[PDB]
Design an enzyme around this catalytic site. Sequence first.
Site, PDB file in Angstrom:
ATOM      1  N   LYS A 133       3.949  -2.484   8.650  1.00 47.30           N
ATOM      2  CA  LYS A 133       5.150  -1.732   8.287  1.00 47.30           C
ATOM      3  C   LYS A 133       6.369  -2.560   8.649  1.00 47.30           C
ATOM      4  O   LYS A 133       6.649  -2.757   9.811  1.00 47.30           O
ATOM      5  CB  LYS A 133       5.213  -0.382   9.009  1.00 47.30           C
ATOM      6  N   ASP A 169       5.870  16.693  10.829  1.00 45.01           N
ATOM      7  CA  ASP A 169       5.784  16.282   9.435  1.00 45.01           C
ATOM      8  C   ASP A 169       4.364  16.124   8.948  1.00 45.01           C
ATOM      9  O   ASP A 169       4.040  15.164   8.246  1.00 45.01           O
ATOM     10  CB  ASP A 169       6.511  14.968   9.180  1.00 45.01           C
ATOM     11  N   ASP A 179       2.253   8.423  10.644  1.00 41.92           N
ATOM     12  CA  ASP A 179       3.702   8.543  10.395  1.00 41.92           C
ATOM     13  C   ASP A 179       4.416   9.441  11.397  1.00 41.92           C
ATOM     14  O   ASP A 179       4.704  10.595  11.102  1.00 41.92           O
ATOM     15  CB  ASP A 179       4.031   8.963   8.972  1.00 41.92           C
ATOM     16  N   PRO A 195      -0.470  15.941   3.629  1.00 40.23           N
ATOM     17  CA  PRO A 195      -1.597  15.159   3.132  1.00 40.23           C
ATOM     18  C   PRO A 195      -1.301  13.658   2.988  1.00 40.23           C
ATOM     19  O   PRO A 195      -2.180  12.826   3.196  1.00 40.23           O
ATOM     20  CB  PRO A 195      -1.803  15.754   1.742  1.00 40.23           C
ATOM     21  N   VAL A 234       5.161  -0.761   3.351  1.00 37.91           N
ATOM     22  CA  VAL A 234       3.927  -1.056   4.087  1.00 37.91           C
ATOM     23  C   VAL A 234       2.976  -1.880   3.214  1.00 37.91           C
ATOM     24  O   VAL A 234       2.770  -1.536   2.038  1.00 37.91           O
ATOM     25  CB  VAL A 234       3.228   0.256   4.531  1.00 37.91           C
ATOM     26  N   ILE A 266       0.811  -1.216   0.000  1.00 39.89           N
ATOM     27  CA  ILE A 266       0.000   0.000   0.000  1.00 39.89           C
ATOM     28  C   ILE A 266       0.839   1.258   0.000  1.00 39.89           C
ATOM     29  O   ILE A 266       0.351   2.338  -0.315  1.00 39.89           O
ATOM     30  CB  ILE A 266      -1.018   0.067   1.154  1.00 39.89           C
ATOM     31  N   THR A 310       8.698   6.396   6.217  1.00 40.75           N
ATOM     32  CA  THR A 310      10.009   6.999   6.492  1.00 40.75           C
ATOM     33  C   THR A 310      11.068   5.995   6.980  1.00 40.75           C
ATOM     34  O   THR A 310      12.049   6.392   7.650  1.00 40.75           O
ATOM     35  CB  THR A 310       9.900   8.221   7.454  1.00 40.75           C
ATOM     36  N   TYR A 311      10.862   4.698   6.665  1.00 33.03           N
ATOM     37  CA  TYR A 311      11.885   3.684   6.945  1.00 33.03           C
ATOM     38  C   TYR A 311      11.653   2.346   6.280  1.00 33.03           C
ATOM     39  O   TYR A 311      12.610   1.586   6.099  1.00 33.03           O
ATOM     40  CB  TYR A 311      12.207   3.472   8.455  1.00 33.03           C
TER      41      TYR A 311
HETATM   42  C1  LIG Z   1       3.678   5.428   5.238  1.00 33.67           C
HETATM   43  C2  LIG Z   1       2.578   4.899   5.902  1.00 33.67           C
HETATM   44  N1  LIG Z   1       2.278   4.646   7.182  1.00 33.67           N
HETATM   45  C3  LIG Z   1       1.049   4.103   7.392  1.00 33.67           C
HETATM   46  C4  LIG Z   1       0.271   3.897   6.256  1.00 33.67           C
HETATM   47  S1  LIG Z   1       1.220   4.451   4.989  1.00 33.67           S
HETATM   48  C5  LIG Z   1      -1.008   3.380   6.302  1.00 33.67           C
HETATM   49  N2  LIG Z   1      -1.812   3.446   5.235  1.00 33.67           N
HETATM   50  C6  LIG Z   1      -3.039   2.946   5.304  1.00 33.67           C
HETATM   51  N3  LIG Z   1      -3.909   2.990   4.297  1.00 33.67           N
HETATM   52  C7  LIG Z   1      -3.688   3.132   2.999  1.00 33.67           C
HETATM   53  C8  LIG Z   1      -2.926   4.168   2.506  1.00 33.67           C
HETATM   54  C9  LIG Z   1      -2.766   4.311   1.127  1.00 33.67           C
HETATM   55  N4  LIG Z   1      -2.017   5.308   0.642  1.00 33.67           N
HETATM   56  O1  LIG Z   1      -2.370   5.889  -0.654  1.00 33.67           O
HETATM   57  O2  LIG Z   1      -0.891   5.832   1.394  1.00 33.67           O
HETATM   58  C10 LIG Z   1      -3.411   3.456   0.235  1.00 33.67           C
HETATM   59  C11 LIG Z   1      -4.211   2.434   0.721  1.00 33.67           C
HETATM   60  C12 LIG Z   1      -4.349   2.300   2.101  1.00 33.67           C
HETATM   61  N5  LIG Z   1      -3.470   2.417   6.463  1.00 33.67           N
HETATM   62  C13 LIG Z   1      -2.734   2.330   7.548  1.00 33.67           C
HETATM   63  C14 LIG Z   1      -1.441   2.827   7.483  1.00 33.67           C
HETATM   64  C15 LIG Z   1      -0.577   2.711   8.730  1.00 33.67           C
HETATM   65  C16 LIG Z   1       0.534   3.742   8.782  1.00 33.67           C
END
Ligand SMILES: Cc1nc2c(s1)-c1nc(/N=C3\C=C([N+](=O)[O-])C=CC3)ncc1CC2
Lengths: 258, 296
Positions: free
Chosen positions: B33, B127, B145, B130, B18, B10, B14-15
């Site tokens: 992650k 940080d 994040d 959007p 995911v 998905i 920053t490391y």
């Molecule tokens: C760098 C990141 N940290 C997290 C992320 S991304 C995260 N994303 C999501 N949900 C989505 C996020 C996206 N996206 O476009 O970033 C796409 C589908 C699902 N749902 C949960 C998380 C947990 C924390």
Amino acid sequence: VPDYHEDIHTYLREMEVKCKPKVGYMKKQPDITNSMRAILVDWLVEVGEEYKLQNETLHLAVNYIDRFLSSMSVLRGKLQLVGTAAMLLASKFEEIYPPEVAEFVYITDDTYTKKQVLRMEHLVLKVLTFDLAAPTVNQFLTQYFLHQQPANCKVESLAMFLGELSLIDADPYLKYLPSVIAGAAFHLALYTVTGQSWPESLIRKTGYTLESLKPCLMDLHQTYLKAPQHAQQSIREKYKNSKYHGVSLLNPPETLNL
Amino acid sequence: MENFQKVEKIGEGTYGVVYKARNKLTGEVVALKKIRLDTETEGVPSTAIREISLLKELNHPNIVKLLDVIHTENKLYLVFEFLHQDLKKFMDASALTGIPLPLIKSYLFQLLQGLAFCHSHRVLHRDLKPQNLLINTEGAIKLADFGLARAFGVPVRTYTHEVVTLWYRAPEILLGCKYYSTAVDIWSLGCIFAEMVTRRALFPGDSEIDQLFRIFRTLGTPDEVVWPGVTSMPDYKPSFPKWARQDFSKVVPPLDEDGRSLLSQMLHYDPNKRISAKAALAHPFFQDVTKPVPHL
Ligand SMILES: Cc1nc2c(s1)-c1nc(/N=C3\C=C([N+](=O)[O-])C=CC3)ncc1CC2
């Protein structure tokens, strides 16, 4: 300009109770003693100076060590490995750019390998359950400084100095919460430098009467008097510098009038 | 890790990378992650150390819920609750059409509640952007994040070689001050607020001087009167052009008076006069806040 200083000070008072080391932990340690701890903590002061680390990084490392030594038995040959690991983690949490692991191995005179330090770091994390944002004497002192009238550089640097000296000796200072040591430190700096006392503003905010601070203020006074004769001298030497306004050269009061 | 089944990737944080994943036993969908932890690097990265420690203190509806930390020899997994997507994607998908005002106001209200919770628990996010703000189908938005997040029990010192966003960077940081404050997060949230309304980034700068000049040309060049001390800051130059503050009505057209009053108090030059998260929640703009759901 505050708005949540009260919220933060409340929350820091909640956390210090939960992130407190077990008070009588060195009696239950078979191979290590308070005097061994004093040498380790003092060496960490020199590591901080050599690597130009933050005074907060130091305070957090000691807290990690004391929490880790509260639940795990450690032999003397590994006590320095625990401390190095603690300092590496405190550096990762508090410094913008921490020293590399290679450096944390070189400071140990190659007693340990990079492998062992990396492994201890992982064990320390597991034992502490990743709870690294611990309240410190240094933190409370920074808040308390906002209640100066007026600000004084010598008071601030002196308060810090006395706060760091408490880190060396577990033998009294593990029965006091960081906030109480910070209070004792703050009063004693105020009194020695300008003759002022622990202000009314902070009595209402903290709920600590000067009288409640007395037991801790006594121990810290003796420590301040006995400092130049202590087996450990890294903190005195550190606070002889002009960046801390030479506060460690100053003469302690002979009495406290309490 | 045996109980989790990787569905799809998905994103990247920053490391680490995911994935969306499901618990084979409970059925719960999560976000895994994964950070590679071989032998030779610097060990557990500082971004991971901070996100785990700070995030496990913060329990609030508008802050991503760190569910579990799985700890192994050569890899470290952080299990988060799964959210549907991020704001940036929802913005691009809702571009031209526009995100409805009521959903903007709901989102900012929720973001401010999460930010007020962080700041009262001495946590700076640093940080806000959007891509770091996550939404679900029920109308919730959550702060995410926390890799660059810092605890400010002792004042947090300024980077210099930065590693932060730009675009959503506060002017006092660009002018070279020594410390961060909770005001930098409110500056970021102001920019995002404007961005949702205008459907485009408010101050898209390409460097530090380029970023300052973009702020300057919209809010005017700051002087001693609006921001005492500003001419004695390290990265300030008396050769800077003297531009005038534009009328807020031409910067964010589709916004009502209450909205523009709020946005202007979030984009105040002086960090001391800049509105706090707590104070923003009491603002008349949020008097008729509802909970609409996005077309997702
Ligand atoms: C760098 C990141 N940290 C997290 C992320 S991304 C995260 N994303 C999501 N949900 C989505 C996020 C996206 N996206 O476009 O970033 C796409 C589908 C699902 N749902 C949960 C998380 C947990 C924390």
